Design an enzyme around this catalytic site. Structure first.
Site, short mmCIF file in Angstrom:
data_model
loop_
_atom_site.label_atom_id
_atom_site.label_comp_id
_atom_site.label_asym_id
_atom_site.label_seq_id
_atom_site.Cartn_x
_atom_site.Cartn_y
_atom_site.Cartn_z
N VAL A 55 41.50 43.35 -38.19
CA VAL A 55 40.34 42.94 -39.10
C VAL A 55 39.15 42.22 -38.50
N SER A 56 38.07 42.96 -38.50
CA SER A 56 36.73 42.39 -38.27
C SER A 56 36.32 41.44 -39.39
N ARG A 57 35.75 40.28 -38.96
CA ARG A 57 35.39 39.16 -39.78
C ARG A 57 34.36 38.44 -38.98
N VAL A 58 34.37 37.06 -38.83
CA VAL A 58 33.42 36.29 -38.07
C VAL A 58 33.78 36.43 -36.64
N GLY A 59 32.78 36.85 -35.75
CA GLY A 59 33.04 36.89 -34.33
C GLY A 59 32.28 38.07 -33.74
#
Lengths: 499, 56, 50, 468
Positions: free
Chosen positions: A365-369
């Protein structure tokens, strides 16, 4: 003669002063010496035994002070003196630990030189304030075509590294180590991340091999191997990331960063578990400690991007869990998932199916970063992540129409999936990711067949590095995708499909 | 030496075909191959007499 | 070469029992009375400076 | 003196009360005089005020409380030398083969510490094995753990007999075969066969030394038999630079034994009925398997299931330390393949390309690939018809079936069993032989000409004889 010089050391030491407080070992057992006395002692203060076994003050009771022995029950026996050493666990810090293979006291088990270091700092230190931080906006490149597209990582952020045993868990990381061959070599201090690698709970042979791996790839000299060995007791398998971290805090607060490579946090949780059931600390969730939560967060909340109120470094924190055959809805990795943002997983499917890196996008999972991603890459990694969300949905069709679903992002799918397979022990700089990936994004690997992918990619890279060396430079050093590419770099790509 | 031994040997089998009998070609061929092969493995293991006393 | 590399480590082992042999020599000789006293007068001096 | 009278016997957990101001250290060996000889009990905690709490190693038929005890001052020390080879020895190092007392040179404690970080396997390198199959699909290393899979009778006994022969020829090396949860009836049968087949000779020098786990004796002694054997191997390794092979039987009984003793010491057994000290008990045993500056032990351990699963705590922890798997299958042994190794579950992570060589990697990956394509096509080909084959397909059918037969290599030890005098095939000859089948220069050669043969040299003969 070596003996005269050694004998002579022991003679200097011969005249000892008053002991600050003197405990006596009432009994010993469970690896916990039940040391009477030490009436006025700091909590969890380090102690030494006149035997030469050091411990520290883990239990503090009204008439007694349990010591966790770091050393053995063989060399401890009843009566023995337990001298106040006075310090709470602190660590040697700053450089001089570079080129070093070290343990939890930060003392060498390579045996090369003495550790000299500029000062010592506490091993328990607490997280920086809300306002003495700022958001990430600075790229962890890792040297991976794939993983730098999906989720490159913030310089300062914790993001769970998880995925199964020996799925290139030990392997894939030397890529990141070699990426500092681009950045930490160079004089600019916001491109220095000292290679604070760790080996919590790994066997002596493995560790032995690992050192010379880093000497062979010659990143070793700017790295550390903050090791621990599965043969010896829980306090090593406990204090090692905290030790590592304090190292990282020194760099971090000086405006240099640490690339802190936390292998293996599953061993630590096991050590924790084990020490609970040794010392009768009652079996919590799934019989894993109650406080193993607090243990992982206490370490990982240290990590930030600092603003400029405490320096300019970062703790580039890489919480490596190595899962025993999956089981991610176990207590240890559920806790860790919450303590981290996004994620990275490598698979006993893909890796042994002969596709490595073995990544699955869903379990990553892509999220903050991925806001720390530089423009050129982001422009075509966004497209990639959709196209692969399609390849997934398009693979999962059996419950063909010959359409945009079932052929186009099947092809473009398969094509980029093969492109991404990387033989390891290679850094890939930032301009050797996007032009390749970009080619799949325009579907200029759709002419290319499932063989020809790298024949394409490699002959394209050579033809690029002769006539477009300047464009490669602009892609990595502006960090951008510019109008002059949307002409010539695309024209390059198009010309090279046939020839 | 050896290479002659094996190429003419295999050749004479396809020649035994032009006549009658070819069942003691197989014993002739087996013998000659085998001991050629025994000396061939020794010859490739070959090292002259040696011990070191200035490298150690 | 195998023994020679053993022999380096082995040298410390031959010496070690020799240290031990001198301890037995100490505890038999009146080094046992006299040095026990020497420690004692250093101990008085140390304890006094506190 | 440090002497004390026995003051309790809860279980086989014997609390002995010692004279004021003198008590043993932990891990010591206590000797208790009795009308049965001695009981060698090992101290695992102090209770204090000069009392101890120990574990037993020799059995307990009842003990009168008021018996004299003697503290030896340190751990139980088992004999070493080439005067113990070919003799069955118990946990405290005494004959249980009943050939009566045995000679010795030196005694050395069964607890020793992992070698220095200087004396390590700093480089993976290949230890050659007499079996071509091993050397391809999971080639052996120096200071390596290679985990055998399957039970006993699955092809187990022959795989083990061969190895003991190979090492000796290879270097001049030895072995110590340890059995944990070895049944006393069965161990006699094995010993009688080992003697017949030349892996145990009745001279002072032999190959394999036998160390056996007596299940009628305490749990402490099941766990410590492993360390008793490790020590004999280590002497050979330290002071004569011999490469050894330490076999284990059940690593299942290692874990069971070790848990019973925690449980008895009060340390909570939770997490699927296994001990908390699981990681460290392994860690000690397996870090003593390493390359030093003269010698290198190398280890075959056997994994046997703990409740019809591999997700349980005991398998996982074993596995982590592992670096190869060799996967013996009973089905494959019934089809008359010696070795009984399943050629798609034999794996190594020392099968890189700079450890094993770039060439050896290429041959080996095609071998896997050919059989993998073969087995999958055969599923639906059998049913539909074998006239539904393509040109591409039948080159694969040809190559795979001929490779499969070629796997059968008699061994010298299993000469009686397989029916042919054994072969030994080494690292050059594994690549050359399997390579040739790949370029299909030996696809004009029958399958009864790949049956019971070794490397490239051997199979030349057969092609001639089939026709003759």
């Amino acid at each position: 003669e070596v003996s005269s010089i050694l004998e002579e050391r022991i003679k200097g030491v011969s005249d000892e002063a008053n002991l600050n407080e003197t405990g006596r070992v009432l009994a010993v057992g469970d690896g916990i010496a039940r040391v009477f006395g030490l009436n006025n002692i700091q909590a969890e203060e380090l102690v030494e035994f006149s035997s030469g076994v050091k411990g520290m003050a883990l239990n503090l009771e009204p008439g007694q002070v349990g010591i966790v022995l770091f050393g053995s029950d063989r060399l401890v026996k009843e009566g023995e003196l337990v001298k106040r050493t006075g310090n709470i666990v602190d660590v040697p810090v700053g450089p001089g630990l570079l080129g070093r293979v070290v343990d939890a006291l930060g003392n060498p088990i390579d045996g090369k030189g003495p550790i000299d270091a500029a000062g010592r700092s506490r091993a328990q230190v607490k997280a920086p304030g809300i306002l003495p931080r700022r958001s990430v906006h600075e790229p962890v490149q890792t040297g991976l075509k794939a993983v730098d597209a999906l989720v490159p990582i913030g310089r300062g952020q914790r993001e769970l590294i998880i995925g199964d045993r020996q799925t290139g868990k030990t392997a894939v990381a030397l890529d990141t180590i070699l990426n500092q061959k681009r950045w930490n070599n160079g004089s600019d201090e916001s491109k220095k991340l000292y290679c604070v690698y760790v080996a919590v709970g790994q066997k002596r042979s493995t560790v032995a091999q690992l050192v010379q791996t880093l000497e062979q790839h010659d990143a070793m000299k700017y790295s550390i191997i903050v090791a621990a060995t599965a043969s010896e007791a829980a306090p090593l398998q406990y204090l090692a990331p905290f030790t590592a971290a304090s190292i990282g805090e020194w760099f971090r607060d000086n405006g240099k960063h640490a690339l802190i490579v936390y292998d293996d946090l599953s061993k630590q949780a096991v050590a924790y578990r084990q020490l609970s059931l040794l010392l009768r600390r009652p079996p919590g969730r799934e019989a894993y400690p109650g406080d193993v939560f607090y243990l992982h967060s206490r370490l990982l909340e240290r990590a930030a991007k600092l603003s400029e109120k405490e320096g300019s470094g970062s703790l580039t924190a890489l919480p490596v869990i190595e899962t025993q055959g999956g089981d991610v809805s176990a207590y240890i990795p559920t806790n860790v998932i919450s303590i981290t943002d996004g994620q990275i997983f490598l698979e006993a499917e893909l890796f042994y199916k002969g596709i490595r890196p073995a990544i699955n996008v869903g379990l990553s999972v892509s999220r903050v970063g991925s806001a720390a991603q530089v423009k050129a890459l982001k422009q075509v990694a966004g497209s990639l992540k959709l196209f692969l969300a399609q390849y997934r949905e398009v693979a999962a069709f059996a419950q063909s129409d010959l359409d945009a679903s079932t052929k186009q992002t099947l092809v473009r799918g398969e094509r980029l999936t093969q492109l991404l397979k990387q033989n390891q022990y290679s850094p890939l700089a930032t301009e050797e990711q996007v032009p390749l990936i970009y080619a799949g994004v325009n579907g200029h690997l759709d002419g290319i067949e499932l063989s020809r992918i790298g024949e394409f990619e490699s002959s394209f890279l050579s033809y690029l590095k002769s006539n477009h060396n300047e464009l490669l430079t602009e892609i990595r050093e502006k960090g951008e995708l510019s109008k002059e590419l949307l002409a010539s770099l695309k024209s390059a790509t198009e010309s090279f499909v046939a020839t | 030496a050896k290479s002659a031994a094996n190429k003419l040997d295999w050749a004479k089998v396809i020649s035994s075909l032009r006549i009658t009998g070819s069942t003691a070609t197989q014993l002739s061929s087996f013998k000659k191959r085998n001991d050629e092969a025994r000396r061939q493995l020794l010859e490739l293991q070959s090292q002259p007499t040696e011990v070191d006393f200035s490298h150690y | 070469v195998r023994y020679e590399a053993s022999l380096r480590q082995l040298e410390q082992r031959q010496l070690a029992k020799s240290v031990i042999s001198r301890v037995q020599s100490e505890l038999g000789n009146p080094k046992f009375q006299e040095k026990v006293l020497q420690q004692s007068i250093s101990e008085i001096e140390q304890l006094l400076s506190k | 003196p440090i002497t004390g009278k026995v003051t309790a016997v809860i279980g086989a957990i014997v609390d002995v009360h010692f004279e004021q101001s003198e008590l043993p250290a932990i891990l010591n060996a206590l000797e208790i005089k009795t009308p049965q000889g001695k009981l060698v009990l090992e101290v695992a905690q102090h209770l204090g005020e000069n009392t101890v709490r120990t574990i037993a190693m020799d059995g307990t038929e009842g003990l009168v409380r008021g018996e004299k005890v003697l503290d030896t001052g340190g751990p139980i020390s088992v004999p070493v030398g080439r005067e113990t080879l070919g003799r069955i020895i118990n946990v405290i190092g005494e004959p249980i083969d009943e050939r009566g007392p045995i000679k010795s040179k030196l005694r050395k404690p069964i607890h020793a510490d992992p070698p220095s970080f200087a004396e390590q396997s700093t480089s993976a390198e290949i230890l050659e094995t007499g079996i071509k199959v091993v050397d391809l699909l999971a080639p052996y290393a120096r200071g390596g753990k290679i985990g055998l899979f399957g039970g006993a009778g699955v092809g187990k006994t022959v795989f083990i007999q061969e190895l003991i022969n190979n090492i000796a020829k290879a270097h001049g090396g030895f072995s110590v075969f340890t059995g944990v949860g070895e049944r006393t009836r069965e161990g006699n049968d094995l010993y009688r066969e080992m003697k017949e087949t030349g892996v145990i000779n009745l001279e002072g020098e032999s190959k394999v030394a036998l160390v056996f786990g007596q299940m009628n004796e305490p749990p402490g002694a099941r766990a410590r038999v492993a360390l008793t054997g490790l020590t004999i191997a280590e002497y050979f390794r330290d002071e004569e630079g011999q490469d050894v092979l330490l076999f284990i039987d059940n690593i299942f009984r290692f874990t069971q034994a070790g848990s019973e003793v925690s449980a008895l010491l009060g340390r909570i057994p939770s997490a699927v009925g296994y001990q908390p000290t699981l990681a460290t008990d392994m860690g000690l045993l397996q870090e003593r398997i390493t390359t030093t500056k003269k010698g290198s032990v190398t280890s075959v351990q056997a994994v046997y299931v703990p409740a019809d699963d591999l997700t349980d705590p005991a398998p996982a922890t074993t596995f982590a330390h592992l670096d190869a798997t060799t996967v013996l299958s009973r089905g494959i042994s019934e089809l008359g393949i010696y070795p009984a190794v399943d050629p798609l579950d034999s794996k190594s992570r020392l099968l890189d390309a700079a450890v094993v060589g770039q060439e050896h990697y290429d041959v080996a990956s095609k071998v896997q690939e050919t059989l993998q394509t073969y087995k999958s096509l055969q599923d639906i080909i059998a049913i539909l018809g074998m006239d539904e084959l393509s040109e591409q397909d039948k080159l694969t059918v040809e190559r795979a079936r001929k490779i499969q037969r070629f796997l059968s290599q008699p061994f010298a030890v299993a000469e009686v069993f397989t029916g042919i005098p054994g072969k030994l095939v080494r690292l050059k000859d594994t690549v050359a032989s399997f390579k040739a089948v790949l370029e299909g220069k030996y696809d004009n050669i029958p399958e009864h000409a790949f049956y019971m043969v070794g490397g490239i040299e051997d199979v030349v003969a057969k092609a001639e004889k089939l026709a003759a």
